[PDB]
């Protein structure tokens, strides 16, 4: 009697939480005694790349930049037409053995921006500018490979450590500038935040005491203020509500200090339309974790606000005399509808509301239609966002989490079209996107041992080898985020049985530690 | 008629704040464009320094420490012994072009032990070990020096940046260990924190988010806990009160994130009776830049306290047979003395309460006495201890304060008996004890403009030339922490009138701006 279910979904909320978040995106336990260390290999390494760049090379990245990725490098920086000035006098200080750190601090902004470049500049674009020629010698690998492949990826990687070790000149321990915050918030665009989890959290950290270091509570002009300092105030804003995002973005174990938590929710411009939705998807996800239910009254308080917001996005039009225009219109419409996704979810999950499912079966496809819309359009570089990587993976899971249990053609189909698009999202999301292909495929064969096996009820629960399973990749995950045994390291340095023989021969062919990166 | 002095009292609260604080100990507005960056100068000479320790004189220093302070570096590291161990593999890899992260982890942990070594070693015992012979020269300040001046103190502080230097080798940024956490600790028994404060608040805030990384709430060893995991909380929540002491002790404007606001007064083990002491120094100047005033019965709550805090502590005894006693016992004395200076200062301001003054001369005199009592067992190395520093600072400005208004022969003689004892703590303190000999000397010569000139009712308030000199020396420190133009140069660039004759007089001869180090 499937009467259980009920308790199975809301399991899924924690399986969401630990594998398809903090698992497969935030973890990364590491042996320190096997870690090698120096500040010799990033000095030389970050000093080659910044070689491989030549003037021109660079400021075509500009172009690439003021007229495909306003949509994301704004909310911290601005118009780059200022910026230009920087990338020149960049070159011109570039010949220099006197080096300040108002210097240092300009150049690696201006290299976590080529970094975000890279990362987006259509793969054909990137090859009519460099060449793997100087480069696959350089590293080591054969010229077996080229642009279209992680070889691209292998810059986004790298230019973005020349803009850490770039930082690293200017000790910003010791001075800390919004510059630090900047470049951060455009690191942010990348997949930066989940390459380097352990990092990213400890420069965010760094951040939010930059950011307060500042001590601007009120970001409005207020009456009588210096034009000059008027204008601060309001790009500080815009590069606050900027922060609050990555920052709750990157929540979890590994990032313990919060920022964004000092901004209520909604339910209590174009640039904070961006927070104001993603307040509305922290106000959904926080449930994943948590003990407690969404009252309904809430879900419903969140659905009027997407509405109005939903309004709000298509009544800003869109004309496609710009990739910027195009791309903004993107992320809004993939926000809203992620959200969306994550509300109608949540509707099926803790009230199994009607037309619940219906809903969910909608905006998955809403979502597949918006990234599938992009190769339509050679505009594909607008699927290498963060945002997509994230929103597919959660709503492949649960398809493919709830197609193992409540059979439906209709879902079996969308699984689908998922699992395709899952295949096929661009390679610049490298380990990850193979991670959460071992994940889904993973999930399926979890759906086959339980058409073959048998359910029984003990009477008080139900048993079952998948169950087991389930249960079990979340306490080896959450496991594999308890810091205790590396205190215990760097302190004093001292140191139903059938199923049980089913899970554990799954458990060796699947084990979920492989989706750890 | 001197009947404007009560708010006369109650403005020094800010004074002390702002000048004797904020301004000699943590401020430092450093213009970037002016200052040298680069990971070249640290990495060259830190490796230098590194050559200079020989094996057997680096563990003379480890005895010095075990044999010394104990009272210092306990609370982060518990009995030495069991590093001994590490300073011996810490040569045996000195050998190696191939070196880890838990290896420069464990490197850093005993460069900052030996840093706060050389910074407590009397001057004396430290000849009879190293010799400025092979130093005066790399350097490059003639012979015409030696261990008597500042060339001890030119290892306190490189010793220091070997300590950081290292650090900045385990990319601690990217793997959070509690031995960070230990060798900040250790680095904060010194004037580090003062020498550095923008760099040791970015450090600090670092060991906030690793501490937390490890999501410890209770210390306590709860039940069926494997012995070695109930050891390492117990040990962590040592680290945690050393912690949030250090963290208290650093509050300011250039340090906005908090941990040891997680920790309750007490208004609502030896080593925990530290921040015993510590949360009741707190309890009393928070008041300082606050606007309210400590009820009369809360003052009596903390003098309650502090009672069997006294107590408590004479009632824990003391053998002259090792001097980590005798420090230990030092630390308890000055701590409360001073607690209880601070508790009838604010009863003498805030309410004139009967016996206020005999009571503030009485522990003003208790901690002369303290720190006079050192020079005489030939332990004088105890005075050393920044705490030291920071209690002279504020028992000499206000009773220096307290003398240009309210004349009185026992306390014009309490401030010769200051002034003196002021120019004779040992000289580890640098640049800061002329600062605060600067500070004094000036608050005198702010008595002869109180003397000479004529006060006047003006029927609302009172007017005087010293009276604004005070007011400006807040609003000048005040301004040189208000990062709004840092923010402004980081971003897009773009940028009663006798007395106004007598005060900007003063304000030539004597700046304030003068104690900024």
Redesign the interface.
Known sequence: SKEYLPDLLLFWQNYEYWITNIGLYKTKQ??????????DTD?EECMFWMNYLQKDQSFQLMNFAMENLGALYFGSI?DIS?LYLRVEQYWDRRADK????????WDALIWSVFTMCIYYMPVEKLAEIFSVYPLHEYLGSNKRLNWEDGMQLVMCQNFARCSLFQL????????????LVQAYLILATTTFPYD?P??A???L??C??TF?????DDFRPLLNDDP??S??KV??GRIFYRLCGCDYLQSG??K??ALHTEVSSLLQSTEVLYWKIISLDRDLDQYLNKSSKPPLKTLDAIRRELDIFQYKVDSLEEDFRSNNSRFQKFIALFQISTVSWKLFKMYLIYYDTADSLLKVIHYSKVIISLIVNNFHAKSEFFNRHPMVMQTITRVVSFISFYQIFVESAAVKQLLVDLTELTANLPTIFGSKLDKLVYLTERLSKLKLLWDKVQLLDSGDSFYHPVFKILQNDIKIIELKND??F???????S??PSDFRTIVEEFQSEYNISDILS
């Open positions: 590491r042996d320190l005694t096997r870690t090698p260390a120096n500040l000095t601005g200022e006197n080096h300040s750190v108002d210097g240092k601090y690293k000149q200017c000790d910003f321990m010791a001075h800390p500038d919004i510059r380097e352990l990092l959290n400890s420069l950290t760094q939010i005491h307060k270091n500042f001590h601007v000059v300092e204008i601060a790009t500080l174990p590994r313990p200090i810091e205790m590396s205190l215990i390291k760097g302190l004093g001292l140191v």
